[PDB]
Design a protein around this ligand. Structure first.
Ligand SMILES: CCCCCCCCCCCCCCCCCC(=O)OC[C@H](COP(=O)([O-])OCC(O)COP(=O)([O-])OC[C@@H](COC(=O)CCCCCCCCCCCCCCCCC)OC(=O)CCCCCCCCCCCCCCCCC)OC(=O)CCCCCCCCCCCCCCCCC
Ligand SMILES: CCCCCCCCCCCCCCCCCC(=O)OC[C@H](COP(=O)([O-])OCC(O)COP(=O)([O-])OC[C@@H](COC(=O)CCCCCCCCCCCCCCCCC)OC(=O)CCCCCCCCCCCCCCCCC)OC(=O)CCCCCCCCCCCCCCCCC
Ligand SMILES: CCCCCCCCCCCCCCCCCC(=O)OC[C@H](COP(=O)([O-])OCC(O)COP(=O)([O-])OC[C@@H](COC(=O)CCCCCCCCCCCCCCCCC)OC(=O)CCCCCCCCCCCCCCCCC)OC(=O)CCCCCCCCCCCCCCCCC
Ligand SMILES: CCCCCCCCCCCCCCCCCC(=O)OC[C@H](COP(=O)([O-])OCC(O)COP(=O)([O-])OC[C@@H](COC(=O)CCCCCCCCCCCCCCCCC)OC(=O)CCCCCCCCCCCCCCCCC)OC(=O)CCCCCCCCCCCCCCCCC
Ligand SMILES: CCCCCCCCCCCCCCCCCC(=O)OC[C@H](COP(=O)([O-])OCC(O)COP(=O)([O-])OC[C@@H](COC(=O)CCCCCCCCCCCCCCCCC)OC(=O)CCCCCCCCCCCCCCCCC)OC(=O)CCCCCCCCCCCCCCCCC
Ligand SMILES: CCCCCCCCCCCCCCCCCC(=O)OC[C@H](COP(=O)([O-])OCC(O)COP(=O)([O-])OC[C@@H](COC(=O)CCCCCCCCCCCCCCCCC)OC(=O)CCCCCCCCCCCCCCCCC)OC(=O)CCCCCCCCCCCCCCCCC
Ligand SMILES: CCCCCCCCCCCCO[C@@H]1O[C@H](CO)[C@@H](O[C@H]2O[C@H](CO)[C@@H](O)[C@H](O)[C@H]2O)[C@H](O)[C@H]1O
Lengths: 135, 231, 80, 53, 62, 105, 383, 168, 103, 85
C-alpha cells in the first residue's frame, strides 16, 4: 500500500527528458544494432570499429592511472630512500635533480631482469655511497 | 579490517548500459551445452535440470569481461585470488550438491559403490566408493585451481616477454644504423611473431577455460540426473 | 582482404550464370562514390571524413602526443 | 502489435524455458498448408460418402 | 565475433571512418612512444643516480 | 545412470546365504551378524540396499569438507607439549576481607 | 490487485465481526469435516484409508496417487449435503490463509503488525468473512479473480512448454486435443475433442509426478497461500483434498441434477469454485450452464461409473484456461503509420552502410554481374 | 523473563576473562552442556515418537514388515510387536502441514522451555558462586552494566608467582 | 500478461530470484560470507608492514604508530580513563612520583 | 617479485579498522534492543534464533579445556612462528 511492487507504477511522465534520451539511444543503436554485430555471450561484439575504438581508450585511461597514481608511489619511495630517507630531504633538491632520479628509476624499470646488475650491485672498489651512508 | 575498493568494470558497465538499453538477439554462447542436456527425444527429467542456465550465462559474462579484457596492458583482474575462486566454486558446486542431497533419495547414491556383486565388497567396492566420494571434492578443487593457475601463468609469461621486448627495442634499436642490423631485425621479427602467438593463445585459452569451468559443474549435475521415457 | 585480423565481408552471388549473363550493366545510374567498383578496394573513391586530413597526419599527431607525454617533464619539471 | 507471440515468449522464459527451438511442435505443424481445390473436392467427397453410409 | 564492419584496404583509407581515424592516432602514439624512449633513455647527458647503491628494491623485497 | 527398481520380496535371497569375513554366520552364530561389518555389507548388496554403504560415506566427506575441517583447523587442540602448564587452581577466589554485593531479592 | 487505503479501512472496520464469523464457520466446518472423515474412514477403500505409498520411478519420492489416494464417496449425500460441501471448501480456503497469517504472527511476535497493515490493505489474502455487504464481497471476488488471472498463464505455459519440448503426441486426435486444450477463453473448447489429452499426459506426467514449481503455480492459481511452500507434499495434500471434495460434490450434482434447480448466484459460485466462471465476465445463466455441462462432459462417463476423474493436471489446465484471456492489444491501427528510428536520421549513412545499400539495393544485380565478371577476368589473367 | 539478553554480556566477559575461571564455574558450564545434550536427546525422542504415531498404516507395514535384514529372530519379533501395537488402535495420520505442525511444535516447545529454564538455573548458580565471576554476575544484575577489569580492581586471587602486580 | 522479470520492480525480483529460483545458492553464499568475516577479517600490524602497503611500509613516519596513538588518545579522552591507576602502571601513585623525582 | 606485484587490485580507496570486542558488543546491544520488547515472547522462534546459537557457542568456548596454547587472535605480530606471544 505504501510502495508498489509493479514496475507499471510510473513516477514520471512518458515525455520526461525525451530528447536527451533519444540522443543517447541514437548513440547506442547506430553501431550496435546491426546484423554483423553479433556478440559472443554479450562481451565480444562483431563490429570491428568497436574494438578499434575501445581498446585504445581502455589502454589510455589505464596507463594514465598507473603512471600518475600507482608507479608514482614506487618512484617517490626510491627518491626518499636514496636521498635522505625523508620527504623534506627530497624537497631540498631541485626539480632537475628529481627529474634525473626519476628517469634513472625508469631506466631500472626498463632493464628489469634483462640488464646490467651494476645499477643496484656496487662493484668492489667503487667510491659511491653505500647503504650505510645516511645511517 | 574493512577495505573499500572497486572493480575494474566501470567503463564496461557503462558500455553495457549504453549498448543494451534496447534488446538484441544472442546466438553465440561459450557454453551451449547447458541448454541441450537431452539429445534423445521422448526423454524428460522431473528435476530442475535447466536451473543452471542463468548462472552459467552470468558467470560467462563476468569472467569474460574480466579475463578477455585483461590482455589489454594494465587491465586488472580484480578477483584473481585463490581463495576467492575457491569461494565461488564452493558456492556453485556445494549448492547443487545440497540440492541433490536435500532430495532425500538415498538410492541416488547407489552408483557410488563401484563394481558388481562379484567384486569383494569390503576390500574393493568400499574403497572405490571412498575414492569416488573423495574425487567429487577433488573435482571441485581442481576446477578452481585450474582456473586460477591458467590466468596466473599466462599473465606472468606475458609480463616477462613484454619486459624483454621493451628492453631490446629501446636499448638495441640503434643497431638498425649499425653493421649488425640484420641480427636486430631477425630478433625483432621473432619477437613480433612471439607477441602475436602469445596473444592468440591467451585469447583462445581464456574462452576454453571458461568452457571447462562450466562443463565441470554441468557434469556434476548430469552425474545425478535420471531420465524417464514418455509412453 | 584483411587488415590484421579484420577481414572484409564478401557478398555471396545469388544469380546463376545464365541469368547473370543477361544483366546489362549501366554505371551511369551508380553513385559517384562507387564507380569502377572493385571488391579488392571498394573505398578507394570514398570521401574523407575531414577534408585535407590524411591518415599519415593522424599518425603523426599520435606520435607528437607520445613525444609530448615523454618529454614535457624534461622542459617543465615539477617538484615532489 | 503481435501480442500472442510476446506473451508466449515472455511466459516461456519466466518459467525457465530458455530454449528458442521447438523441433517437435514444428514437426507436428511444419507440413500444414492450405489445400488445393482438387484436394477439397476429394475430402468433401469422403465426408459425403461417410454421411451417406 | 569478428563478423563485419568497415575495413580499410591500406593505410591511406584509415581516414575514411572516424573510428579508424582514432585507431590510427592511437597506433601512432603506441609506435612513436618507443623512439621517444630511445632518445630519452639513451641520452649522452643521462647520468645514473650517485646514491643508487644506497637502496634498491632487491634489498627491500628480500 | 539408469532407473533403479527395488527388488520384490521374493527376489531377496535368504539371510543364511550371506557370507562374513571368514564364513557364513548361520545357526549358532546368528548373533555375530550384528558385529560383522562385512556380513552386513554383503547382506545390503544382496538386498539391493547399497545406499547404506554409500550414503554414510559421502555425507561424512561433505561434513568434513564443509564444517568439521575448518573447526579442527581453527579451534582444534594440537598435541600437548612435553613440559605441561597445569593449573594450580589458585586464581579466581575473592580476597580476604572482601564484601561481596548481596544477591537479588 | 494492489493495496489501497479504502480496502484497509474496510478490513479494519470489519476485523472483529469477521473473526467472529470465521470462528462460527470453523465450528460448522469442523462438524461437516468430522462427518466426512468418519464416513471416509468407515466406508473408504483399504488403500485410501491406509494411505498407500506411491513412489516416483526416478527418485522414489512419495506423493498422492490419483487412483489410490483419492476416493469419490458416491453415497455422501445421505450424510452431507452439497451446500455443506461448498461451505467446507470455502472455509478450507479461508482457514488456510488465516493459518498462514497466524503462523507468521506467532513466529514474529509483535513485529508482524506492519505486515498485518499490508495484509488488510488488500483483499487477496483476507477471508471472505471480512466482507459484510454485497459490494465488499464483489470487490473481494474481483481481487481473487485478478490473482487467478495473474497466476494461471504461467502454469499453463509451464505445462505446455515442458511437454512440447520433451515430447510429442502419438496420433492426430491427441495432437488436436493438445492444441485445442490451451486455447484462449474467447473461444469455446469441445470437451470431447480435448479429453484424450488427459490420457496422453498420464503417459507423460501423472499427478504423482508433478514438479514443485508447477505445483507452486497451480496453488497460486487456486488462491492457496504458498509461503512457506516447504515440501511439495503439503500443498499437494491441500490440492488433493480440495479436488476430492469438489469431485464428491460434482458426483452428487450430476446424479441428482442439482445444477438445473440451482439458483443463479449459487450456480455462479459453484462454477467459480471450479475455476470456470470469472465474476468480471458478467456471465448469464446460459453461459454458466454451458460451462458446467462442458466440465461434466470432460469428467466423462467413467466418473459416474466408477468415480475416476481424468488426469488432475490436465483437468486443472482445462478449467484454468478460462482465466487465460486474449493478449491485450490497445491502440488504433493508424499508430502503425509512424516511424521508430527517426532519431537516427541525423546520423546518416557511413561508408559501410552506403556500400551495403549499393550492393543490396535495386542495383544489386548489376553490381553482382560486374563484380563476378571482373573477378573472372582477374582469375583468367592470373592463370 | 528474558535471561539470555542479560547472560550474553556475562558470557562474553567470561570468555574475555576466562583466566579467572575457577573449577566451580567450569563444572557449571559442563553441566550446562550436559543438560543441553539431554534436552536434545529427549526432544529428538519426542519427535521420533510423534512421527511414528502419525505414520501411515502402509508406511508402518513396509517399515516394520518383511524382509528382515539380519533375520536373527529377535528382530522379526520386535518388528511384529511394534507393528501390531501401532496398527491395533486407530491413529490420526495427517499429511502435509498438519504432520509438520504436530511433529515439530511440541518438540520446539519442549526444547525451548527446557533450555530457557536451564539458562535460568545457570544464572542462579552463578549468582550463588563465591568467586569473581559470581561477583560480576551480581554486579551486572544490580547496576545493569558489565564492569570490565573487575578482577584486577578488587584484586582477585592470583598464583603465588603473579602477585607482583597487586603489590601497590 | 504477468512476468516476474518484466512486471516486478528490481528489489522484488531480486527477492523472488534468490528465494524461489536460487535459494540454496543464496544460503551457501551467506554461510561463506559469515565464515569469511568470522575467520578472515583480521590483519596484524606486522602483516600490514610486510604486505599491506603498495611500495612498502614507510618506517620513516610509522603511520601505524600515529593511528594507534590517535585511537588510544580518543579512547582515553572519551571514556575518562585514568592511565596513572596502579593497575596500568603496577605501582602506587606515590611510587610514581618518587620515580619521577629520581629520573 | 616485481612481476608478482602486478597482480594486485588497482583501485584501493580506504581501509577501516575495528576491534572484534567493540563491534561484537555493539551488535549485542542492538540485538538486546530489538529482542527486549514485551511483544516478542522468549518462546518465539525469532528470539531463540537470535540467542540460542550464540549461547551454545559461548558455552562451548567456556567448557574448552585444551592441553595446548592458542595464541591471542589479535596480537601485534602473528608472523613469527617461534613467538606465540
Ligand atoms: C568515514 C569516511 C566515509 C566512509 C564511511 C564508510 C562506513 C563503513 C561502515 C562499516 C562497513 C564494513 C564493511 C565494509 C565492506 C566493504 C567491502 C567492499 O568495499 O567490497 C568491494 C565492493 C566493490 O563492488 P563493485 O563490484 O565495485 O561494485 C559496487 C559499486 O558501487 C558499483 O556497483 P553497481 O554499479 O552495481 O551499483 C548500483 C549502481 C547502479 O549504477 C548507478 O546508479 C550509477 C552510479 C554509481 C554510483 C556508485 C559508484 C561509486 C563510484 C565511486 C564514488 C563516486 C564519486 C563520489 C564522490 C565523493 C566526493 C568526496 O547504483 C548505485 O550505486 C546506487 C547509488 C546511486 C547514488 C546516486 C546519488 C545521486 C545524488 C544526486 C544529488 C543531487 C543534488 C542536487 C542539489 C541541487 C541544489 C540546488 O563493494 C561493494 O560491493 C559495496 C561495499 C559497501 C559496503 C557497505 C558500506 C557502508 C555504507 C557506506 C556509505 C557511506 C556514505 C557517506 C559517504 C560520504 C562521503 C565521504
Ligand atoms: C506457543 C508456542 C508456539 C511455537 C512456535 C510456532 C511458530 C509458528 C509456526 C506455525 C504454528 C502454527 C500456526 C497456527 C496454524 C493454525 C492451526 C492449523 O494447523 O491450521 C490447520 C491447517 C492445516 O493445513 P492443511 O494443509 O489443511 O493440513 C493438511 C492435513 O491433512 C489436515 O488434516 P485433515 O485433512 O485430516 O483435516 C484436519 C482439519 C479438520 O479441521 C477442520 O476442518 C476445522 C478447522 C481446524 C483448523 C482451524 C485453524 C484456524 C486457523 C486460524 C486461527 C485464528 C487466527 C486469528 C488471527 C488474528 C488474531 C488476532 O483440522 C486441522 O486443521 C488439524 C491439523 C492438525 C493440527 C495441527 C496443530 C498442531 C500444533 C498444536 C498442538 C501443540 C501442542 C504442544 C504440546 C507441548 C508438549 C511439550 O494449518 C495450516 O494451514 C498449516 C500452517 C501454515 C503455516 C506454516 C508455517 C511453517 C510451519 C513450520 C513448523 C515447524 C515446527 C515448529 C518449529 C518452527 C521453527 C522454525
Ligand atoms: C493489526 C493487524 C492484524 C493482526 C496481525 C495479523 C497477522 C499479520 C501478519 C501476516 C500477514 C501476511 C500477508 C502479508 C501480505 C503483504 C506482504 C508484503 O509486504 O507485500 C508487499 C508490500 C506491498 O504489497 P501490495 O502493494 O499489496 O502488492 C501485493 C501484490 O500481490 C504482490 O504480491 P507478490 O506475491 O508479487 O509479492 C511477494 C513479494 C513480497 O516482497 C516484497 O514485495 C518486498 C517488500 C520490500 C520491498 C522494499 C522496497 C523499498 C526499499 C527501500 C530501501 C531504503 C530506501 C531509503 C530509506 C531511507 C530512510 C531514511 O515477494 C515475496 O513474497 C518474497 C518473500 C521473501 C522471503 C524471505 C525469506 C528469507 C529467509 C532467510 C533464509 C533462511 C534459510 C534457512 C537457514 C537455516 C539456518 C539454520 O510491500 C510494501 O508495502 C513495501 C513496504 C516498504 C516499506 C519501506 C521500506 C522498508 C523500511 C524498513 C524500516 C526498518 C526500520 C528499522 C531499521 C533499523 C536499523 C538498525
Ligand atoms: C537492488 C537492491 C534492492 C535491495 C535488496 C535487499 C538485499 C537482499 C539481499 C539478499 C536477498 C536474497 C536472500 C535469500 C535468502 C535465502 C532464502 C531461502 O533460502 O529461502 C528458502 C525458502 C524459499 O521460500 P518458499 O516458501 O519456497 O517461497 C518463497 C517465495 O518468495 C514465495 O513466493 P510466492 O509467490 O510463492 O508467494 C507469495 C506470497 C504468498 O502468500 C502467502 O503465502 C500468504 C501470506 C504469508 C505470510 C507469511 C507466513 C509465514 C508463516 C511462518 C513462516 C515460518 C516462520 C519460522 C520462524 C520465524 C523465524 C524468524 O507470499 C508473500 O507475499 C510473502 C510475504 C513476505 C514478506 C516479507 C519479505 C521480506 C521483507 C523484509 C522484512 C524483514 C526485514 C528484516 C531485516 C530488517 C530488520 C530491521 O524459504 C522458506 O522456506 C521460507 C521460510 C521462512 C522463515 C521465516 C523467515 C526467516 C528469516 C529471518 C526473518 C527475520 C525477521 C526479522 C523481523 C524484524 C526484527 C527486527
Ligand atoms: C535431511 C538432510 C539431508 C541433506 C543433507 C545435506 C548436507 C550433507 C549431509 C552431511 C552434513 C554436512 C554438514 C553441513 C553443516 C551442517 C551443520 C553441522 O555440521 O553442524 C555440526 C555441529 C557440530 O558441533 P560443533 O559446533 O563442532 O561442536 C562440537 C560439540 O560436540 C558440540 O557440543 P554440543 O553440546 O552441541 O553437543 C553435541 C552433541 C549432539 O548430541 C547430543 O546433544 C546428544 C544426542 C542427541 C540425540 C538426538 C536425537 C536422536 C534420536 C533419539 C532417539 C529416537 C528413538 C526413540 C525411541 C526408541 C525406542 C527404543 O554431540 C556430542 O557432543 C557427541 C556426544 C555423543 C555421546 C556418545 C555416548 C556413547 C553412547 C552412545 C553412542 C554409541 C552407541 C553404541 C550402541 C551399540 C549397540 C550395539 O553441530 C552438531 O553436530 C551438534 C549440534 C546439533 C545436534 C543435532 C542433533 C540431531 C542430529 C540429527 C539426527 C537425526 C537425523 C540423522 C539420522 C537419519 C536416519 C535416516
Ligand atoms: C529458529 C528455529 C530454528 C529451527 C532449527 C531446526 C530446523 C528447522 C525447523 C523446521 C523448519 C520448518 C520446515 C522443516 C522442513 C519441512 C519438511 C516437510 O515439508 O515435511 C513434510 C512432511 C509431511 O509429509 P507426509 O506426507 O506426512 O510425510 C512425508 C513423507 O513420508 C515423504 O515421503 P518420502 O518418499 O519423501 O520418504 C522419505 C522421507 C522419510 O522421512 C520422513 O519424511 C519422516 C519424518 C522424518 C524422520 C526423521 C527421523 C529419522 C530417524 C532418526 C534416528 C536418529 C538416531 C540417532 C541415535 C543417536 C544415539 C547417540 O525423508 C527421508 O527419508 C529423510 C530422512 C531424514 C534424513 C536425515 C539425514 C541427516 C544427516 C545428518 C548429517 C550430519 C549432521 C551434522 C553432524 C551431527 C552429528 C555430530 O513432514 C514430515 O514428515 C515431518 C516434518 C518435520 C519438520 C521438522 C520439525 C522441526 C522441529 C524443530 C525442533 C527443534 C527446534 C530447535 C530450535 C533451536 C533454537 C532456535
Ligand atoms: C522432561 C524431563 C524433565 C527432567 C527433570 C529432571 C529429572 C531428574 C534429574 C535427572 C538426573 C540429573 O543428574 C545429572 O547427572 C549427570 C551425570 O549423569 C550430571 O552431570 C555431571 O556428570 C557428567 C558425567 O559425564 C558430566 O559430563 C557433567 O558435566 C556433570 O555436570 C548432571 O549434573 C546431573 O544433573
Amino acid at each position: 500500500v505504501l510502495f508498489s511492487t509493479y514496475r507499471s507504477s510510473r513516477l514520471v511522465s512518458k515525455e520526461f527528458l525525451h530528447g536527451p534520451v533519444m540522443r543517447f539511444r541514437a548513440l547506442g543503436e547506430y553501431y550496435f544494432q546491426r546484423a554483423w554485430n553479433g556478440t559472443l555471450n554479450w562481451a565480444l561484439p562483431g563490429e570491428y570499429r568497436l574494438y578499434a575504438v575501445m581498446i585504445p581508450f581502455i589502454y589510455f585511461y589505464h596507463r594514465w592511472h598507473n603512471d600518475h597514481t600507482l608507479d608514482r608511489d614506487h618512484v617517490e619511495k626510491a627518491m626518499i630512500m636514496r636521498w635522505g630517507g625523508t620527504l623534506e630531504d627530497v624537497r631540498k633538491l631541485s626539480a632537475k635533480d628529481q627529474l634525473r632520479v626519476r628517469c634513472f628509476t625508469d631506466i631500472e624499470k626498463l632493464y628489469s631482469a634483462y640488464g646490467p646488475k651494476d645499477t643496484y650491485l656496487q662493484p668492489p672498489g667503487d667510491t659511491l655511497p653505500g647503504k650505510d651512508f645516511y645511517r | 579490517m574493512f577495505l573499500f575498493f572497486f572493480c575494474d568494470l566501470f567503463w564496461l558497465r557503462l558500455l553495457l548500459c549504453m549498448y543494451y538499453c534496447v534488446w538484441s538477439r544472442l546466438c553465440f554462447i561459450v557454453y551451449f551445452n547447458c541448454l541441450m542436456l537431452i539429445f534423445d527425444f521422448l526423454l524428460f527429467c522431473l528435476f530442475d535440470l535447466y536451473l543452471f542456465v542463468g548462472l552459467c550465462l552470468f558467470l560467462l559474462l563476468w569472467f569474460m569481461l574480466f579475463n578477455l579484457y585483461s590482455l589489454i596492458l594494465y587491465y586488472c583482474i580484480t578477483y584473481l585470488n585463490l581463495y576467492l575462486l575457491f569461494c565461488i566454486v564452493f558456492l556453485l558446486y556445494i549448492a547443487f550438491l545440497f540440492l541433490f542431497c536435500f532430495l532425500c533419495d538415498f538410492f541416488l547414491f547407489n552408483n557410488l559403490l563401484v563394481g558388481d556383486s562379484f567384486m569383494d565388497v569390503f576390500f574393493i567396492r568400499f574403497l572405490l566408493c571412498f575414492l569416488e566420494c573423495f574425487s567429487l571434492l577433488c573435482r571441485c578443487l581442481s576446477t578452481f585451481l585450474r582456473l586460477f593457475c591458467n590466468l596466473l601463468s599466462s599473465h606472468f609469461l606475458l609480463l616477462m616477454f613484454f619486459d624483454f621486448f621493451y628492453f631490446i627495442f629501446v636499448f638495441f634499436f640503434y643497431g638498425v644504423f649499425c653493421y649488425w642490423f640484420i641480427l636486430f631485425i631477425f630478433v625483432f621479427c621473432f619477437c613480433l611473431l612471439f607477441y602475436v602467438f602469445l596473444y592468440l593463445l591467451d585469447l583462445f585459452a581464456a574462452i576454453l577455460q571458461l568452457f571447462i569451468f562450466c562443463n565441470m559443474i554441468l557434469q556434476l549435475i548430469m552425474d545425478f540426473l535420471l531420465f524417464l521415457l514418455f509412453v | 582482404y584483411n587488415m590484421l585480423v579484420f577481414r572484409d565481408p564478401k557478398r555471396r552471388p545469388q544469380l546463376s550464370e545464365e541469368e547473370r549473363a543477361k544483366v546489362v550493366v549501366n554505371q551511369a545510374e551508380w553513385p559517384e562514390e562507387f564507380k569502377d567498383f572493385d571488391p579488392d578496394d571498394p573505398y578507394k573513391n570514398s570521401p574523407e571524413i575531414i577534408k585535407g586530413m590524411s591518415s599519415w597526419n593522424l599518425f603523426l599527431w599520435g606520435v607528437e602526443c607520445a613525444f609530448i607525454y615523454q618529454f614535457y617533464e624534461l622542459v617543465f619539471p615539477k617538484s615532489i | 502489435w503481435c501480442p500472442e507471440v510476446r506473451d508466449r515468449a515472455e511466459l516461456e522464459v519466466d518459467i525457465t524455458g530458455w530454449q528458442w527451438w521447438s523441433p517437435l511442435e514444428e514437426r507436428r505443424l511444419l507440413p500444414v498448408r492450405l489445400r488445393s481445390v482438387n484436394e477439397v473436392r476429394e475430402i468433401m467427397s469422403k465426408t459425403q460418402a461417410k454421411k451417406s453410409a | 565475433m569478428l563478423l563485419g564492419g568497415f575495413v580499410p584496404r591500406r593505410f591511406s583509407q584509415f581516414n575514411r571512418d572516424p573510428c579508424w581515424m582514432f585507431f590510427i592516432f592511437s597506433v601512432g602514439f603506441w609506435l612513436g612512444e618507443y623512439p621517444a624512449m630511445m632518445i630519452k633513455y639513451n641520452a649522452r647527458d643521462l647520468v645514473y643516480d650517485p646514491h643508487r647503491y644506497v637502496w634498491s628494491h632487491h634489498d627491500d623485497h628480500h | 545412470g539408469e532407473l533403479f527398481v527395488r527388488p520384490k520380496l521374493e527376489e531377496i535371497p535368504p539371510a543364511d546365504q550371506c557370507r562374513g569375513f571368514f564364513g557364513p554366520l548361520n545357526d549358532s552364530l546368528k548373533f555375530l551378524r550384528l558385529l560383522d561389518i562385512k556380513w552386513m555389507m554383503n547382506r545390503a548388496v544382496a538386498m539391493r540396499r547399497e545406499y547404506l554403504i554409500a550414503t554414510p560415506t559421502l555425507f561424512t566427506f561433505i561434513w568434513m569438507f564443509t564444517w568439521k575441517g575448518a573447526v579442527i583447523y581453527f579451534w582444534g587442540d594440537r598435541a600437548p607439549p612435553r613440559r605441561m602448564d597445569w593449573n594450580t587452581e589458585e586464581t579466581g577466589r575473592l580476597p580476604l576481607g572482601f564484601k561481596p554485593t548481596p544477591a537479588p531479592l | 490487485m494492489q493495496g489501497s487505503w479504502s480496502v484497509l479501512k474496510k478490513n479494519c472496520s470489519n476485523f472483529f465481526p469477521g473473526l467472529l464469523a470465521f470462528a462460527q464457520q470453523t465450528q460448522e466446518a469442523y462438524g461437516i469435516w468430522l462427518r466426512i472423515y468418519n464416513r471416509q474412514q468407515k466406508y473408504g477403500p483399504t488403500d485410501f484409508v491406509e494411505q498407500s505409498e506411491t513412489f516416483s520411478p526416478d527418485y522414489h519420492k512419495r506423493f498422492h496417487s490419483q487412483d489410490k489416494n483419492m476416493w469419490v464417496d458416491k453415497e455422501l449425500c445421505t450424510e452431507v449435503s452439497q451446500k455443506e460441501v461448498a461451505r467446507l471448501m470455502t472455509y478450507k480456503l479461508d482457514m488456510w490463509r488465516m493459518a498462514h497469517c497466524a503462523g507468521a504472527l506467532l513466529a514474529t511476535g509483535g513485529y508482524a503488525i506492519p505486515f498485518g497493515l499490508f495484509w488488510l490493505a488488500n483483499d487477496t489474502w483476507v477471508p471472505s468473512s471480512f466482507n459484510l455487504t454485497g459490494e465488499e464481497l464483489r470487490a473481494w471476488r474481483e481481487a481473487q479473480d485478478l490473482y487467478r488471472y495473474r497466476s494461471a498463464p504461467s502454469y499453463l505455459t509451464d505445462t505446455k512448454w515442458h511437454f512440447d519440448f520433451h515430447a510429442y503426441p502419438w496420433n492426430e486426435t491427441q495432437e488436436r486435443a493438445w492444441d485445442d486444450l490451451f486455447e484462449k477463453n474467447d473461444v469455446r473448447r469441445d470437451p470431447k475433442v480435448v479429453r484424450p489429452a488427459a490420457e496422453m499426459y498420464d503417459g507423460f506426467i501423472k499427478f504423482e509426478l508433478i514438479r514443485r514449481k508447477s505445483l507452486r503455480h497451480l496453488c497460486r492459481s487456486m488462491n492457496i497461500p504458498t509461503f512457506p511452500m516447504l515440501a511439495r507434499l503439503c500443498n499437494g495434500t491441500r490440492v488433493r483434498d480440495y479436488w476430492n471434495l469438489a469431485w464428491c460434490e460434482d458426483y452428487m450434482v450430476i446424479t441428482q441434477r442439482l445444477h438445473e434447480s440451482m439458483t443463479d448466484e449459487e450456480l455462479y459460485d459453484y462454477a467459480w469454485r471450479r475455476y470456470l466462471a470469472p465474476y468480471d465476465k458478467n456471465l448469464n445463466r446460459e453461459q454458466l450452464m454451458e460451462r458446467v455441462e462442458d466440465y461434466f462432459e470432460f469428467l466423462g462417463p467413467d466418473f459416474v461409473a466408477h468415480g475416476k476423474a481424468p488426469n488432475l493436471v490436465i483437468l486443472t489446465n482445462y478449467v484454468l484456461g478460462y482465466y487465460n484471456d486474449p493478449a491485450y492489444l490497445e491502440g488504433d491501427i493508424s499508430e502503425l503509420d509512424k516511424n521508430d528510428y527517426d532519431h537516427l536520421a541525423s546520423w546518416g549513412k557511413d561508408a559501410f552502410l552506403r556500400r551495403l545499400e549499393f550492393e543490396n539495393g535495386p542495383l544489386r544485380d548489376q553490381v553482382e554481374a560486374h563484380t563476378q565478371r571482373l573477378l573472372a577476368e582477374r582469375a583468367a589473367i592470373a592463370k | 523473563t528474558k535471561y539470555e539478553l542479560k547472560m550474553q554480556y556475562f558470557d562474553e566477559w567470561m570468555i574475555r576473562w576466562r583466566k579467572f575461571q575457577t573449577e566451580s564455574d567450569w563444572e557449571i558450564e559442563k553441566g550446562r552442556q550436559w543438560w543441553r545434550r539431554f534436552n536434545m536427546a529427549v526432544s529428538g525422542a519426542l519427535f521420533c515418537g510423534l512421527v511414528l504415531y502419525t505414520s501411515g498404516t502402509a508406511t508402518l507395514k513396509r517399515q516394520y514388515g518383511l524382509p528382515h535384514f539380519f533375520d536373527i529372530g529377535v528382530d522379526g519379533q520386535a518388528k511384529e510387536t511394534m507393528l501390531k501395537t501401532l496398527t491395533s488402535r486407530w491413529r490420526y495420520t495427517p499429511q502435509g502441514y498438519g504432520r509438520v505442525l504436530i511433529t515439530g511444535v511440541p518438540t520446539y516447545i519442549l526444547f525451548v522451555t527446557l533450555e530457557h529454564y536451564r539458562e535460568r538455573r545457570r544464572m542462579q548458580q552463578y549468582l550463588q558462586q563465591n568467586t569473581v565471576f559470581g561477583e560480576q554476575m551480581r554486579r551486572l544484575l544490580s547496576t545493569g552494566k558489565i564492569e570490565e577489569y573487575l578482577p584486577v580492581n578488587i584484586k582477585a586471587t592470583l598464583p603465588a608467582s603473579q602477585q607482583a602486580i597487586y603489590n601497590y | 500478461v504477468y512476468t516476474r522479470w518484466k512486471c516486478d520492480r528490481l528489489p522484488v525480483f531480486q527477492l523472488k530470484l534468490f528465494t524461489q529460483e536460487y535459494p540454496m545458492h543464496a544460503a551457501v553464499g551467506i554461510f561463506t560470507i559469515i565464515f569469511l568475516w568470522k575467520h578472515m577479517s583480521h590483519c596484524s600490524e606486522e602483516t600490514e608492514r610486510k604486505y599491506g602497503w603498495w611500495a612498502g611500509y614507510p618506517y620513516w613516519r610509522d603511520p601505524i604508530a600515529r593511528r594507534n596513538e590517535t585511537k588510544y588518545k580518543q579512547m582515553i579522552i572519551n571514556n575518562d580513563v585514568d592511565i596513572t591507576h596502579p593497575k596500568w602502571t603496577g605501582c602506587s601513585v606515590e611510587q610514581l612520583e618518587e620515580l619521577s623525582r629520581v629520573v | 617479485s616485481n612481476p608478482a606485484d602486478h597482480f594486485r587490485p588497482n583501485l584501493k580507496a580506504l581501509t577501516l579498522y575495528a576491534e572484534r570486542q567493540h563491534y561484537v558488543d555493539r551488535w549485542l546491544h542492538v540485538k538486546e534492543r530489538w529482542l527486549a520488547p514485551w511483544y516478542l515472547p522468549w518462546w518465539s522462534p525469532l528470539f531463540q534464533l537470535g540467542t540460542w546459537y550464540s549461547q551454545r557457542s559461548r558455552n562451548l568456548f567456556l567448557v574448552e579445556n585444551h592441553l595446548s596454547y592458542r595464541p591471542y587472535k589479535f596480537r601485534r605480530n602473528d608472523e613469527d612462528r617461534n613467538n606465540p606471544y
